[PDB]
Write a protein that binds this DNA or RNA. Structure first.
Ligand SMILES: [Mg+2]
Ligand SMILES: [Zn+2]
Ligand SMILES: [Zn+2]
Ligand SMILES: [Zn+2]
Lengths: 114, 264, 160, 158, 141, 559, 86, 65, 47, 49, 133, 196
RNA sequence: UCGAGAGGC
């Protein structure tokens, strides 16, 4: 009766943007990115990939409410490292690893009989 | 082969594949199983219009059962979301229309399986919409039961969706998942009465890793990288395609992130 | 009864003493019996204490009994609240009970009294006695829907 | 010894020790007259009634008696200098803080303390549950309405 | 055939009832420690025997599995709540026109069954489902 | 009493409540259908006219919207059924009955209302589903549970009414209650067990988890604290990370058992400037206890900081526990072979003791103590013997419980459970009592027709030597049910009796108000207390502190 | 009963402002601001009448008087300016 | 009233296996454990869907209209 | 339905806990556990 | 699966609750109160079947 | 900024207690029979056996947020095998010219007894601790 | 609810991905708090869970009848025969992260009941709805879109706060306020008043 | 509307 339609878990709203980027307060070189219509599937992976960037200082995400499909990701890097570039390189590394995964699995499965 | 994540397949069948994931961090495998569950698209009945129902069941009862029916979705990429297409309600490029009519003519009880579903809409040459049938007797899954003199006549529109909107669009059944069978990483504290080792049973996956020696100190800096998975599919999409399409959908979500970053 | 009393050095020490506990109460005749401490004798029938030891002793023993019945569970209530209850039961002569026979028989307005029990009977008696209500009570203003002189309404506000 | 009283001085002393970074080695700046006259002045600033007459001033001196005892026990010269290590500024700050928290702990007129007492008594009774003395809700019923023929009269003679 | 007898409250003041036929076995160690310790009968002048002690329970309380391991008020609560569970109250629910009726989609016979269930037709018209449950703290909801 | 002392009122709502972390203490989760139904009259001003026009255009069907417009003359405009619901032009001085919006003051309520802490105001947070949502740490002053309980909600209709809800009845204002002069709210079951498991010395966290735990604190300064361990691997301690929620300037000291400043068992609690030095955190530290962390924070920093403290502790601890886990199982009720053997040995020992005392009584060898019958002495001796045996078996069981046992952990943290519960579940449930005595002789000279007459044996009159784990026998089960029925009836009676008592007290003391001279008076003016509480203090702003003059030798007093 | 007032010198009531009179004052001023009544303080982006009344109070620009009543019938008038707020 | 399509917990289809299960029970005189094991139901989440099912539809069919 | 068809009411009922208590004689005749809670507990009983 | 044992009045199913009473025509001895003038009472509620 | 205390201790006994990865250590100074030590150590990271010898050091450095080492770029101030960071919460006078210092590495406690480190261990939260095998 | 008086309501709904999972991929249909267990001493709940686990794995009925020789140890032997831990614990992984849970979880089938109380049947709200003819107060019940009762207990709780104007508004402006004309001499509302 | 019954915290 009061439940929201399930498509709101992945379907952006009227004026909802996918990413909302804001500068962090009382912190240098730190940024808060509100991901809209997302969940732990993306946030955990983005943070785990960001943590392997040796020039990335702080990186963590939180889901402020399980009702709402959205989360916040805070990133802080060294001076001269724009956080948006840190996020871009993380996403590209993710896509590279996933492509290699797909290639190797396809090789193994086509090798596999039955 | 390629530089990065490695896969070694222990066993493979039409219905499930047991394999090993190497050189991957945990978050990747967890997002992979999450996508395999919810983010990969299929096709299932999302509208039912009933003409006559003389059955012992209610209409929405049968409609829910119909939605749960596994339909073919191998060529689902060529199908479009009915919310994305431009037709009025549902076209041939965004939906698959099925018809189901059955009458109780025998004195004995009549069965309505899923094989009694007939596809009215034009497939346009795509391999979708066919009800999956693994019963050795060839009958579909049991949909309803009829007495002599009862009939059920309805039309089912099947659209494209993902599990998050409803669990009917579920490509997979149960994804097995285990890492570190020996608890070498001290990620869980075993509960016990006398002996943790004798009270807990050894996992099947203990064979594929060397046992730790009690004299060895705690290998502490080591992280989790080798996982044991077993992916099972209902039949809407073959297993290999379930995992591959999940990988692709994860790529697609990260790519949408990247394009949003570019357009910022 | 092991009880604490000042040692000659100064610190408190446990010095046990024998105490008599009865299953009946005759305060007067027991108080005068020799061999006892007539200053420390204690009852749980505080009404007899009110009859013998004066009303203030009555209210002290009343608070004592309420404190005991509270601490029997393990809970604690600040002294002010029990003190308020006791001194209200006490303030008017002896012991005014918490019932329609006690406080609800006082001169505490009319509508306040009928808001508890004997409603129509209290109203009849008030019409007969030609009572005049102060309208400074809570229930009087609530019945009239006016702002009762309660907290926020304890004062008037005017301009410079 | 442990009793409920308005101002928690045990916390104010830690507030002063951390606020002013007491080194515990440098000798204090406090002269004895400062400490003594300051405590005695502070007892004069702990107001509960504002009237100026013998009756009201006696009610005032009586109402702050036990708290003044806790105060003198806590702000004692040997204590302030050897147990605490308050400097002059830390001592004046403790004085002002005590006066503030006291004047803050005073009850506010218009408080409906009767309904408050009634609820504070009735609610823990609602959770009352289970040598032959009547206790709990039976004893409370016996007390509230004056019970002539109470179940367990007892006389405790010393 | 004079093999079972009806007894009221007043008559059973003059009799000695055995708890089970095993209390009539002659008595002339290695007992399992996990079985409950039932005292010896300490009596011989038996006139009757209970059919089965579980027959002291009502219809509703016969649904409770292992009611001998629960604090009794919990069994009272459940016996009052079983009368509120949703299930198939009658096979002819579609034919009857009742002011209110609630029917479970897929009722399930319980996996833990009281032997008093068979005579209660519970396994044939159940009112719950065998939900896989996990007792865990998880997000604090 | 039905239409003047109380009445049915407009602008009200009621529904099921359920608990929600990730919700501030003073927040209440209001369903959208309720927010769309309840209205607040807002007069139009240059400060609101844009927001109000937008709300009116939104319409009553979707939220945030409005339902009615009141013009100057007083003619009412129904935005549901009106041709002009689209071309409204709000002139100054008009009224818009707008929807209930976020951060509005509402008067929340749970019944029975025994407390001012049962009717404290809340900030609105409009939520999707159909349940009222409130913070866990507000359950205690409502006595509410999420088992089907309903709650009421009232909406003010005047600016001064909103001011009274926000400045008098607000939740943070009620944290320290005048009853018991202590905080009436605190950390509860999940957060309690989690904060204990987290603040163990054996609890270390890695950097990845630590960063999420940091970010979860809303008022985080953004300074990553230096880890406890550095060289072999950067590791934090649960105490270290939990310290971030504790604001700076907080000092807490408590000693429990052997609480040396070395504290070999991590007892007590020492917190210096918002940083915990040593001690495991449990109910004594973070519960509604007197002199606990909540009392200190509400006294030093203020109410609002204490509510944010509730929120931060809940978020950090619930996160950590979510990724750590917790369960119960039956294995936590099983004692090993040796302990069970000792328990049954103790039970048989108590049985032999009762047998010997009974035979001694049978030969009239009982020297009956002065002031009671022979049979009363016998019954008291047997009851005390059986209770001693039950408590001794329970203590044996609790000794056998390891630290991984989760009911032992719930007892340690103070979340749920007690020694009695462990004793009945694992050792033996014990003696059942009705009307104070043992199981009476309902049948002539016997308890059940399965016993011979004149049997005063332990099992004959209601001693249950079996545990819930081992299972009760039919007679044991009947006696236990006989006791439980008395329990249920005592509950059902005490409820109504205490309700009447409460009503009587409140009607007797209703007009007692502290006047502007501190004279506790009544409607008539008759003085009750010349000084309220005899000192003039509010029951809050009052703490248990020791008087160092009393006690101690005159020698140490002098020194 | 003609005047029954009390001179500002011989005032024995509390100098501090009680939470009850503070709440009544804030509510009355917020009701004034609810209607288009003049505001006597600069607003730094404030629209809620409650916060505007709180800021008017923090700068002591609320020209109201509190008439505290004594039980005999006498009273004491206190300007909001005189009263302290803690 | 009738067999659910898939298991409640994991989603493995079970709707096709009802008649095969009954045939394995009656025609082959098998027991419920091995009868479920042969139908590829290895998780107990799946097994409880078939094993604890009450075919109430056979009672609804007996009603004539 | 079954439990309603086996239900006895004691019309005596203020609360006096002597009739409402589970008497020893109830063994085998009246169910020990099954009874309404709160008011009219024990008075209403089930066979 | 219906068991009967109810009536049908104007479409509504109705059940007669077993009314519990004390058996008549039995002699019971009852002690009177402590302040009572009379000490014991032997009552019989004679009922004609 | 520089080293504040240095010594070499011999371990008397190690007590695990109710904990599974932490141990209580008690050690005596070697060649200076005047100073004793008690410490909560992580036996899971750095194993510690009874009757061992440990080089103990306490520094002041080597405010600002923590950052992990990017590479071998940062020059460590430790050839040691164990390091902790803690706060001083008490200094007690055991005897005349004999002192004891208390430390808390995030809950892991430390007591140090002696009077030859007098004007080194200040009343500062900046306690560092280093331990070499 | 369950068959042991363990009543409760749904507070949240998680999809299978966010739910925790075991190594077999099995996911809980329900999750209950361990804190509801020890205060009630409903051990039969957990014993039923164990017996239902063994019954599902084995394909036999669970003899949960009381007064039998069924013991937790005899059940645990069977459960271990089926390769599971004997007390019902199982390694579970967090769904959000995929990392193992430090605690092992009590996991098994348990017969649960859906009670008659549902929120949309109990939810209710009102603002200036219908009134009663005699009292001119809001009508009773949500079936008539009535108002909630501000009982005298709640009046007392409000008086404890000193919310005077709130009480006046909630007792007059939110219900049955009315205006009457009275004469200063007689003092009763017997005045005839032609307003036009 | 009145009267009655059952149920929830
Ligand atoms: Mg409830
Ligand atoms: Zn289309
Ligand atoms: Zn399954
Ligand atoms: Zn007149």
């Amino acid at each position: 009766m009061n439940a929201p339609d399930r498509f709101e878990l992945f379907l952006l709203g009227e004026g909802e943007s996918k990413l909302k980027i804001d500068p962090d307060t009382k912190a240098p070189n730190a940024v808060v990115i509100t991901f809209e219509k997302e969940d732990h599937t993306l946030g955990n992976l983005i943070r785990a990939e960001l943590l392997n960037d040796r020039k990335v200082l702080f990186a963590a995400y939180k889901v402020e409410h399980p009702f709402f499909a959205r989360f916040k990701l805070r990133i802080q890097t060294t001076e001269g490292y724009d956080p948006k570039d840190a996020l871009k390189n993380a996403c590209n590394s993710i896509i590279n690893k996933l492509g290699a995964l797909k290639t190797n699995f396809e090789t193994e499965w086509n090798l596999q009989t039955l | 082969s390629e530089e990065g994540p490695q896969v070694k397949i222990r066993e493979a069948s039409k219905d499930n594949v047991d394999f090993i994931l190497s050189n991957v961090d945990l978050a990747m495998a967890n997002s992979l199983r999450r996508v395999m569950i919810a983010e990969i698209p299929t096709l299932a009945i999302d509208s039912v219009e009933v003409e006559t129902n003389t059955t012992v069941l209610a209409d929405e009862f049968i409609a829910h059962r119909l939605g749960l029916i596994p339909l073919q979705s191998m060529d689902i990429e060529q199908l479009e979301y009915s919310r994305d297409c431009f037709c009025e309600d549902h076209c041939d490029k965004c939906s698959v229309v099925l018809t189901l009519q059955a009458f109780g003519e025998s004195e004995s009880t009549t069965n309505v399986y899923s094989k009694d579903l007939v596809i009215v809409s034009n497939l346009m040459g795509r391999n979708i919409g066919h009800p999956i049938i693994q019963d050795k007797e060839g009958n579909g899954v049991l949909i309803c039961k009829l007495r002599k003199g009862q009939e059920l006549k309805l039309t089912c529109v099947a659209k494209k969706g993902i599990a998050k909107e409803h669990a009917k669009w579920g490509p997979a059944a149960a994804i097995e998942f285990e890492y570190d069978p020996w608890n070498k990483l001290k990620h869980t504290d075993y509960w016990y009465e006398q002996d943790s080792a004798k009270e807990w049973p050894q996992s099947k996956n203990c064979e594929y890793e060397d046992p730790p020696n009690e004299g060895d100190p705690f290998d502490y800096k080591a992280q989790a990288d080798t996982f044991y998975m077993n992916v099972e599919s209902v039949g809407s999409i073959p297993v290999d395609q379930v995992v591959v399409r999940g990988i692709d959908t994860l790529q697609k979500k990260v790519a949408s992130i990247l394009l949003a970053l570019t357009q910022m | 009864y092991d009880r604490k009393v000042p040692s000659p050095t100064g610190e408190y020490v446990k010095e046990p003493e024998w105490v008599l506990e009865t299953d009946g109460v005759n305060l007067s005749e027991v108080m005068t019996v020799p061999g006892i401490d007539p200053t420390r004798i204690y009852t749980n029938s505080f009404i007899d204490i009110m009859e013998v030891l004066g009303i203030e002793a009555g209210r002290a023993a009343l608070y004592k009994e309420v404190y005991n019945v509270i601490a029997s569970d393990g809970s604690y209530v600040n002294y002010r609240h029990m003190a308020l209850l006791v001194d209200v039961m006490t303030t008017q002569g002896g012991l005014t009970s918490v019932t329609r026979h006690g406080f609800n028989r006082s001169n505490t307005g009319a509508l306040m009294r009928c808001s508890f029990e004997e409603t129509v009977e209290i109203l009849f008696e008030a019409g007969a006695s030609a009572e005049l209500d102060d309208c400074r009570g809570v229930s009087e203003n609530v019945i009239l829907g006016q702002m009762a002189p309660i907290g926020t309404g304890a004062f008037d506000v005017m301009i410079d | 010894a442990n009793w409920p009283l308005p101002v928690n001085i045990r916390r104010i002393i830690q507030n002063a020790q951390q606020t002013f970074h007491i080194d515990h080695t440098k000798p204090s700046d406090l002269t004895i007259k400062d400490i003594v006259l300051g405590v005695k002045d502070l007892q004069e600033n702990l107001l509960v009634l504002r009237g100026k007459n013998e009756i009201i001033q006696n009610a005032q001196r009586d109402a702050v008696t036990l708290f003044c005892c806790l105060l003198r026990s806590r702000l004692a010269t040997r204590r302030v200098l050897q147990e605490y290590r308050l400097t002059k500024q830390a001592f004046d700050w403790v004085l002002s803080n005590i006066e503030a928290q006291f004047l803050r702990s005073v009850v506010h007129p218009g408080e409906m303390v009767g309904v408050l007492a009634a609820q504070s008594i009735g609610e823990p009774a609602t959770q009352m549950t289970l040598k032959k003395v009547t206790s709990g809700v039976p004893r409370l019923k016996e007390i509230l309405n004056v019970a002539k023929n109470m179940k367990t009269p007892s006389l405790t003679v010393y | 055939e004079g093999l079972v007898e009806y007894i009221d409250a007043e008559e059973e003041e003059s009799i000695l009832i055995a708890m089970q036929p095993e209390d009539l076995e002659p008595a002339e160690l290695d007992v399992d420690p996990a079985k409950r310790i039932r005292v010896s009968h300490h009596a011989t002048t038996f006139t009757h025997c209970e059919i089965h002690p579980s027959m002291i329970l009502g219809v509703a309380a016969s649904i409770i599995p292992f009611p001998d391991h629960n604090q009794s008020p919990r069994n009272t609560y459940q016996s009052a709540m079983g009368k509120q569970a949703m299930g198939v109250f009658l096979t002819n629910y579609n034919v009857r026109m009742d002011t209110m009726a609630n029917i479970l989609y897929y009722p399930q016979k319980p996996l833990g069954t009281t032997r008093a269930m068979e005579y209660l037709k519970f396994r044939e018209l159940p009112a719950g489902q065998n939900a896989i449950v996990a007792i865990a703290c998880y997000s604090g909801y | 009493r039905g239409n003047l002392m109380g009445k049915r009122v407009d602008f009200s709502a009621r529904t099921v409540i359920s608990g929600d972390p990730n919700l501030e203490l003073d927040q209440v989760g209001v369903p959208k259908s309720i927010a769309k139904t309840l209205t607040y009259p807002e007069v139009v001003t240059p400060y609101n006219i844009d927001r109000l026009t937008q709300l009116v255009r939104n319409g009553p069907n979707e939220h945030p919207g409005a339902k009615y417009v009141i013009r100057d003359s007083g003619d009412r405009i129904d935005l549901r059924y009106s041709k002009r619901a689209g071309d409204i032009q709000l002139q100054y001085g008009w009224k818009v009955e707008r929807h209930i919006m976020d951060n509005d003051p509402v008067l929340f309520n749970r019944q029975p209302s025994l407390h001012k802490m049962s009717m404290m105001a809340h900030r609105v947070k409009v939520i999707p589903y159909s349940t009222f949502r409130l913070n866990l740490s507000v359950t205690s002053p409502y006595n509410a549970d999420f088992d089907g309980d309903e709650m009421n909600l009232h909406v003010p209709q005047s600016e001064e009414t909103r001011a009274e809800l926000s400045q008098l009845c607000a939740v943070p204002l009620q944290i320290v209650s005048p009853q018991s002069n202590k905080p009436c709210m605190g950390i509860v079951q999940d957060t309690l067990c989690g904060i204990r498991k987290l603040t163990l010395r054996d609890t270390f966290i890695e950097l990845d988890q630590v960063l999420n735990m940091l970010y979860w604190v809303p008022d985080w300064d953004g300074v990553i604290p230096t880890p406890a361990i550095i060289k072999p691997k950067p590791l934090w301690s649960g105490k270290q990370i939990l310290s971030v929620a504790i604001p700076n300037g907080i000092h807490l000291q408590r000693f429990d058992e052997g609480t040396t400043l070395l504290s070999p068992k991590d007892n007590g609690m020492l917190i210096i400037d918002g940083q915990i030095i040593f001690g495991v955190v449990e109910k004594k530290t973070v519960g509604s206890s007197n002199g606990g962390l909540i009392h200190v924070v509400t006294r030093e920093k203020g109410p609002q900081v204490c509510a944010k403290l509730f929120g931060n502790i809940q978020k950090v601890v619930n996160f950590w526990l979510l990724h750590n886990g917790f369960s119960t199982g039956i294995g936590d009720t099983i004692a090993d072979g040796p302990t069970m053997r000792e328990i049954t040995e103790t039970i048989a020992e108590a049985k032999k003791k009762v047998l010997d005392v009974t035979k001694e009584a049978q030969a009239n060898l009982l020297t009956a103590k002065h002031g009671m019958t022979l049979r009363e002495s016998f019954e008291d001796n047997v009851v005390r013997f059986l209770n001693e045996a039950r408590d001794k078996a329970g203590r044996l069981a609790e000794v056998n419980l390891k630290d991984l046992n989760n009911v032992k952990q719930m007892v340690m943290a103070g979340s749920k459970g007690s020694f009695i519960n462990i004793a009945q579940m694992s050792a033996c449930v014990g003696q059942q009592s009705v009307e104070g005595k043992r199981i009476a002789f309902g049948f002539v000279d016997r308890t059940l027709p399965h016993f011979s007459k004149d049997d005063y044996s332990p099992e004959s009159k209601g001693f249950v030597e079996n545990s819930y784990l081992r299972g009760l026998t039919p007679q044991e089960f009947f006696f236990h049910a006989m006791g439980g029925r008395e329990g249920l009836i005592d509950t059902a009676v005490k409820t109504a009796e205490t309700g009447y008592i409460q009503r009587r007290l409140v009607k007797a003391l209703e007009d007692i108000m502290v006047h502007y001279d501190n004279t506790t008076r009544n409607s008539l003016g008759n003085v009750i207390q010349f000084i309220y509480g005899e000192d003039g203090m509010d029951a809050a702003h009052i703490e248990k502190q020791s008087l160092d003059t009393i006690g101690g030798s005159d020698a140490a007093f002098e020194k | 009963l003609k005047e029954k007032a009390i001179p500002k010198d011989q005032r024995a009531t509390t100098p501090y402002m009680t939470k009850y009179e503070r709440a009544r004052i804030l509510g009355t001023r917020a009701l004034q601001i609810s209607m288009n009544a003049p505001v006597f303080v600069d607003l730094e982006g404030e629209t809620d009448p409650l916060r505007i009344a709180m800021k008017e109070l923090a700068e002591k620009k609320i020209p109201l008087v509190i008439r505290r009543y004594l039980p005999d019938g006498s009273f004491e008038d206190w300007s909001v300016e005189e009263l302290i707020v803690d | 009233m009738i067999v659910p399509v898939r298991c409640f917990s994991c989603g493995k289809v079970v709707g096709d296996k009802w008649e095969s299960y009954l045939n394995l029970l009656q025609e082959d005189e098998l027991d419920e454990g091995t009868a479920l094991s042969r139908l590829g139901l290895k998780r107990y989440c799946c097994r409880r869907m078939i094993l604890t099912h009450v075919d109430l539809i056979e009672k609804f069919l007996r009603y004539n209209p | 339905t079954l439990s309603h068809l086996r239900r006895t009411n004691t019309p005596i009922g203020g609360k006096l806990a002597k009739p409402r208590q589970l008497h020893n004689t109830h063994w085998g005749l009246v169910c020990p556990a099954e009874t309404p809670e709160g008011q009219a507990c024990g008075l209403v009983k089930n066979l | 699966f219906d068991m009967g044992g109810y009536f049908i009045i104007n479409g509504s199913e109705k059940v007669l609750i077993a009314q519990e009473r004390s058996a008549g025509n039995i002699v019971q001895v009852f002690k009177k109160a402590a302040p009572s003038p009379i000490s014991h009472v032997a009552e019989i509620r004679s009922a004609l079947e | 900024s520089n080293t504040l205390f240095d010594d070499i201790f011999q371990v008397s006994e190690v007590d695990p207690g109710r904990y599974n990865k932490v141990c209580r250590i008690e050690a005596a100074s070697t060649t200076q029979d005047q100073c004793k030590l008690t410490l909560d150590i992580n036996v899971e990271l750095f194993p510690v056996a009874a009757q061992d010898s440990l080089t103990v050091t306490i520094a002041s450095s080597l405010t600002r947020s923590w950052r992990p080492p990017q590479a071998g770029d940062r020059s460590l101030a430790d050839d040691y095998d164990y390091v902790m960071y803690g706060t001083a919460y008490k200094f007690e006078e055991v005897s005349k010219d004999l002192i004891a210092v208390y430390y808390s590495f995030g809950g892991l406690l430390m007591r140090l007894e002696g009077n030859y480190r007098n004007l080194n261990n200040l009343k500062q939260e900046n306690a560092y601790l280093l331990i070499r095998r | 609810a369950s068959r042991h008086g363990q009543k409760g309501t749904i507070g949240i709904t998680y999809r299978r991905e966010d739910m925790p999972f075991t190594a077999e991929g099995i996911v809980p249909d329900l999750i209950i708090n361990p804190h509801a267990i020890p205060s009630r001493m409903t051990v039969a709940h957990l014993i039923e869970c164990l017996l239902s686990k063994v019954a599902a794995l084995s394909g036999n009925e669970g003899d949960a009848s009381p007064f039998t020789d069924i013991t937790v140890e005899g059940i645990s032997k069977l459960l271990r025969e089926h390769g599971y831990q004997s007390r019902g614990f199982e390694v579970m992984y967090n769904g959000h992260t995929g990392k193992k849970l430090m605690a092992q979880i009590f996991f098994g089938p348990t017969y649960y009941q859906r009670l008659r109380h549902m929120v949309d049947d109990k939810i209710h709200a009102r603002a200036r709805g219908p009134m009663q003819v005699l009292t001119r107060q809001p009508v009773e019940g949500r079936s008539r879109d009535g108002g909630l009762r501000f009982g005298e207990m709640e009046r007392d709780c409000m008086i404890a706060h000193g919310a005077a104007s709130f009480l006046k508004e909630r007792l007059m402006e939110a219900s049955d306020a009315f205006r009457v004309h009275i004469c200063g001499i007689c003092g009763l509302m017997t005045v005839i008043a032609k307003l036009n």
